[PDB]
Design an enzyme around this catalytic site. Structure first.
Site, PDB file in Angstrom:
ATOM      1  CB  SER A 160      -0.908  -0.095   1.046  1.00  0.00           C
ATOM      2  OG  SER A 160      -2.019   1.194   1.070  1.00  0.00           O
ATOM      3  CG  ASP A 257      -6.608  -1.724  -4.699  1.00  0.00           C
ATOM      4  OD1 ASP A 257      -7.116  -0.522  -4.140  1.00  0.00           O
ATOM      5  OD2 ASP A 257      -5.379  -2.246  -4.284  1.00  0.00           O
ATOM      6  CG  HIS A 287      -5.767  -1.621  -0.989  1.00  0.00           C
ATOM      7  ND1 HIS A 287      -4.653  -1.361  -1.911  1.00  0.00           N
ATOM      8  CD2 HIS A 287      -5.224  -1.067   0.483  1.00  0.00           C
ATOM      9  CE1 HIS A 287      -3.814  -0.532  -1.319  1.00  0.00           C
ATOM     10  NE2 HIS A 287      -3.963  -0.458  -0.146  1.00  0.00           N
TER      11      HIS A 287
END
Lengths: 319, 319
Positions: A160, A257, A287
């Protein structure tokens, strides 16, 4: 809520969250938002075996920086090493929330992870955390013997915003001419401070990470529009010349995502610049599929983690 | 090798160790001895869920002391608290080797554990670690709000030499007149620097903890014979008057343990001094049955851990 095609266990997870209700994450104080991830990660029995964890504080680029060194258990000698930069949207995240993901990467690669305890936002803003991240990466390259690693065989990894951080540390290492990096592992990375990709539009809500969360994450990180345009904030904005010579990359993206398209776009830019890239989209996933402990036994997640560990291993071998 | 009556899984464990060979622990450097426990604890998948762990460094009695605060996950508000002093014969042990045991006590009690990172031996000698242990206990009593606990509801707990440490901290708190303690949890404690009890003679070898190890542990801790005679080293040597007024105790001992008799003898001395004591011998068990991860799913061990957590809970309630 989810969508047609979301992997079955992931879909059940999304529905369970919907029933549970609760405020949107971005309406919480940073402290309360941090507790959401802490509590959720702790609610699941997970395998953390096969590692030995030791904390180390270093003096690097004018500050004390805390590390967690995560070594494969029962192994003697110098081992190769990857820096690990955690996700959580800059506001959230830390070592224990990410320990299972880190453990999977260590056990699966046989390499040592060096978690860097960068300063969260909004307590700090860009570029504080990336400067700490780079400083720690250079320190490991130079001082690896002190923590049982071969600093000449060094990769960067993160999920991320931690994937953003890994990509940016690789760019900073190029700009600084040091240290040499073997590999960058970019797990569903944030790569651009813009919100108009097709995936951002399609998955704005209902798929765990929302557009509202991403804008809040970016706002806490920095509201300086000029900072956001820098390649050290938005690496997607780098030119081919700026990306030339970066280390080989594995980029995993999640199908469902908002960040999917910018991650895949960054892989394309690396490829266009002559960098070796393997870019893989894990279909059915949301995600942070590799972070969230309630998803840690989903078969596609296990397969993705096996791949991430194996690719670290492949790129960290002796010559 | 074991004995008739050793619990079946424990006996298999002892036999597997015998086949594996390897040097006696006491012939290893402290560093290599520490690695034996680290590696063995890491070789077993264990449940560590339901807790949130955060490190805290404090300034207490002239030094920096590192704590690990282990809180039940997803719980709001002030919670009662027990200090946790780890075992390992003073030479070995630390937080991660003991994390599963600590986790079981936290999840089972609903109370917060404060692990104290005392200085190991022979790097330090008596009374360094017990002074750090007491200092940290007084700090938690005074400053509990800072780490989310009610310092007025405070217990001490530990396994093996950590049980020695808990008992001794309780004596030091009595001598100092502070802090008030609700409970002392003594898990298979060391209580006397002497080696002539019936259990020491019976279980000298073949039952994991050997007499040779205990003498080495004591030698690393201190070779000062006068220090060993002090009640803060050997609490079994305390008189009834010295033990009077100590907090209620649960002492668990292992049937097949050189330290069994001195632990049970200490319980008897507390009882003779008017202290409330529950003293329970877990039959079939070896020393550190609640520590060793390969034994963590043995049914008697689970029952012992359920009891330890429940008794903490019972003694840490509001009024």
């Amino acid at each position: 809520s989810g969508s047609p095609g979301v992997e079955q266990h992931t879909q059940a997870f999304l529905e369970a969250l919907e029933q549970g209700g609760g405020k949107p994450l971005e309406q919480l104080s940073p402290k309360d938002a941090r507790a959401v991830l802490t509590g959720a990660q702790a609610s699941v029995k997970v395998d953390l075996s096969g590692i030995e964890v030791k904390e180390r504080t270093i003096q690097a680029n004018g500050q004390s920086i805390k590390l967690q060194v995560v070594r494969p258990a029962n192994v003697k000698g110098e081992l190769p090493v990857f820096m690990f930069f955690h996700g959580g949207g800059w506001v959230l995240g830390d070592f224990p929330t990410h320990q299972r993901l880190i453990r999977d990467l260590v056990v699966g690669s046989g390499a040592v992870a060096v978690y860097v305890d960068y300063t969260p936002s909004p307590e700090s803003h860009y570029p504080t955390a990336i400067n700490q991240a780079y400083a720690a990466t250079q320190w490991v390259a130079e001082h690896g013997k002190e923590i049982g690693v071969d600093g000449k065989r060094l990769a960067v990894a993160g999920n991320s915003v931690g994937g953003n951080m890994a990509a940016v540390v690789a760019l900073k290492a190029k700009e600084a001419g040091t240290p040499a990096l073997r590999f960058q592992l970019l797990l569903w990375p944030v790569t651009d401070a813009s919100f108009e990709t097709a995936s951002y539009k399609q998955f704005a809500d209902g798929h765990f990470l929302t557009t509202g969360m991403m804008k809040w994450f970016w706002d806490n990180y920095t509201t300086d529009a000029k900072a956001r345009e820098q390649i050290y904030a938005s690496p997607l904005r780098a030119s081919s010349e700026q990306l030339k010579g970066l280390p080989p990359a594995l980029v995993q993206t999640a199908e469902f995502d908002v960040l999917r398209d910018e991650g895949e776009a960054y892989a394309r830019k690396l490829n266009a610049a002559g960098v070796t890239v393997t870019s893989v989209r894990y279909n059915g996933m949301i995600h942070d599929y590799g972070l969230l402990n309630p998803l840690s036994q989903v078969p596609a997640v296990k397969a993705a983690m096996r791949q991430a560990g194996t690719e670290l291993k492949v790129h960290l071998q002796l010559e």
